[PDB]
Amino acid sequence: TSKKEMILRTAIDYIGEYSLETLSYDSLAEATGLSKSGLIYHFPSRHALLLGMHELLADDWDKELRDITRDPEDPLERLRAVVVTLAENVSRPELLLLIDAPSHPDFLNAWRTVNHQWIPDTDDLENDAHKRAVYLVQLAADGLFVHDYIHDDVLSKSKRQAMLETILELIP
Amino acid sequence: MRTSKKEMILRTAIDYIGEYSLETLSYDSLAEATGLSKSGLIYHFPSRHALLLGMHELLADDWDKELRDITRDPEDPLERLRAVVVTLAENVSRPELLLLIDAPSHPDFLNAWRTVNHQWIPDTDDLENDAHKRAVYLVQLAADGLFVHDYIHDDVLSKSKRQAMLETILELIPS
Ligand SMILES: CN(C)c1ccc2nc3ccc(N(C)C)cc3[s+]c2c1
Ligand SMILES: CN(C)c1ccc2nc3ccc(N(C)C)cc3[s+]c2c1
């Protein structure tokens, strides 16, 4: 809708096809059809451009979670929503951006709010078996999310659904 | 002087990806990082493809050796699974993860990982119809989540928290 969002969506597609390393005002101008000046008006620095990409993807996840959560005041329903959203294979651009986020605290902070609001807390995991049982579900969901990239046998739709169901049954 | 020069070059290339990226790894940048001439690099790796293959093979071999070293009674699938979980509790490095993501770009790279995966990682044959296979794969998925944690989440999971979760995942293995 907004021009800023269109620029970001274009940049996200670009890094999957090419790379984060070659994403520049020049390559994004070609990809968007906008002039470099036009791009700079919306993203004053390359750091700001990358930050905007992280922020947009984090917001997309937050919106999907809010859309499917049955009871937002129930942590187990919020956990179910997280598991369901993670059941689909992570997209290539999203995975490459997540791997790049630790390069700067500003990028990690763009992801921090959605993580802080939806991922089960890690405080006292060492001494709280309940918190470990809940976090175990999160870890399995994360494994399903990245599966096709770290295993050499993509999951068929039926096997993926079977594992989603197996993880949902693991919720306390 | 503890390894071959060929292995040193590969370790330097892997570290180069860690400081920069896989995208900019080239004979030129590797020449600078190793202090060797392009001619010297070509002697060991005749093409960039050969260089990438060598990195996949080295990393796959490192994992296989770690698993062989810590697995007692390896003919028992459950002992292999317990050892695999322990090896995956330490977070993957960024260069290794970038290489795993890139492996499908050529069958040679996939093939480099095939032997180790086939010997140690459960297959998903008939997963939809085998409850025991799903129970084992659930453990594999949780271990994988621990392995990639710091690169799909914003927070680094501490050693003590990883230790606690490692124990929790091992408890999940059918016994
Ligand atoms: C684990 N992490 C950090 C992330 C980050 C962003 C994400 N975005 C999504 C966007 C849409 C969607 N749908 C099912 C529509 C699912 C997801 S899952 C997801 C997981
Ligand atoms: C899941 N995948 C694809 C992989 C690939 C390579 C790996 N390499 C290692 C090397 C050493 C080590 N140690 C604990 C010493 C642990 C690991 S875990 C690991 C997992």
Ligand SMILES: [Cl-]
């Ligand atoms: Cl069964």
